């Protein structure tokens, strides 16, 4: 699930103190729930967030 990946990333970014990534993971979750973005674009965006968190 793309939605569960994003809620996991938001929590990890809060713990790491990355406010830009907390805002971005929430924005992607919000746009996906509204049907504003596709699951494909939300998953690629989550992969980018996860890569920044790994650094």
């Amino acid at each position: 699930s793309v939605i569960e990946k994003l809620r996991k990333l938001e929590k990890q970014a809060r713990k790491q103190g990355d406010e830009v990534l907390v805002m971005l993971a929430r924005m992607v979750l919000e746009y996906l729930e509204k049907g504003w973005v596709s699951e494909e674009d939300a998953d690629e965006s989550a992969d980018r967030i996860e890569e920044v968190l790994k650094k």
Binding site: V20, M27, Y31, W36, V37, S38, D41, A42
Partner: protein, 196 residues
């Protein structure tokens, strides 16, 4: 591609408004009949038209979703000549740093290089990598480049030539979720190293 182009975005360049600048990769391309259009990954509207400004194409708007790819097309009236799928968060060009300052401290035998960036007060493109470049004024093609993530760089007195004129400047690139291009250079700062 005869109508080959490239673009850069500037996020929160004018308050919450973003900008998008496109240009043909070949500068001799005649743009008399050519118009630009962006469709997709926009907030309320399906498509937006670019304004033709002498040699570049420009849009300043808040209606960028900033998630998903947009289609930028070159048109002759209603006919599309070429289209390109671009993610606006991967073509960001930061604003140049400003207020560059160099100070020499005798007690520490070092140069403290400081500068400012409007990106520290933004919501999106907040995280940059900076490039501080310096050279002895007399030299051509002999710049030394140093990367940093903060706005303060310390150079040791022993790492520079003594009794010499130096030129120093700084630029930034997005280094986080946002990717893109190097900003314009800040204006140069000139200083002289101590005689030792």
């Amino acid at each position: 591609d005869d109508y080959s182009f490239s673009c850069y975005s500037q996020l929160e360049v004018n308050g919450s408004q973003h900008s998008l600048t496109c240009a043909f990769e070949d500068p001799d391309v005649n743009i008399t009949n050519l118009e630009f259009e962006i469709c997709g990954a926009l907030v309320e509207v399906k498509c937006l038209n670019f304004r033709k400004l002498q040699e570049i194409y420009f849009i300043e708007t808040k209606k960028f979703l900033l998630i998903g790819k947009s289609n930028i097309c070159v048109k002759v009236g209603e006919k599309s000549l070429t289209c390109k799928k671009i993610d606006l968060t991967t073509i960001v060009k930061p604003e140049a740093p400003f207020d560059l300052s160099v100070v020499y401290r005798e007690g520490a035998n070092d140069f403290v290089v400081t500068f400012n960036t409007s990106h520290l007060q933004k919501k999106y493109v907040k995280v940059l990598m900076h490039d501080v470049a310096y050279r002895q004024e007399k030299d051509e093609n002999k710049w030394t480049h140093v990367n940093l993530s903060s706005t303060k760089l310390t150079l040791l007195q022993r790492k520079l030539q003594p009794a010499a004129m130096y030129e120093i400047k700084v630029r930034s690139i997005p280094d986080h979720y946002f990717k893109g291009f190097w900003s314009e250079w800040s204006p140069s700062y000139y200083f002289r190293t101590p005689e030792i």
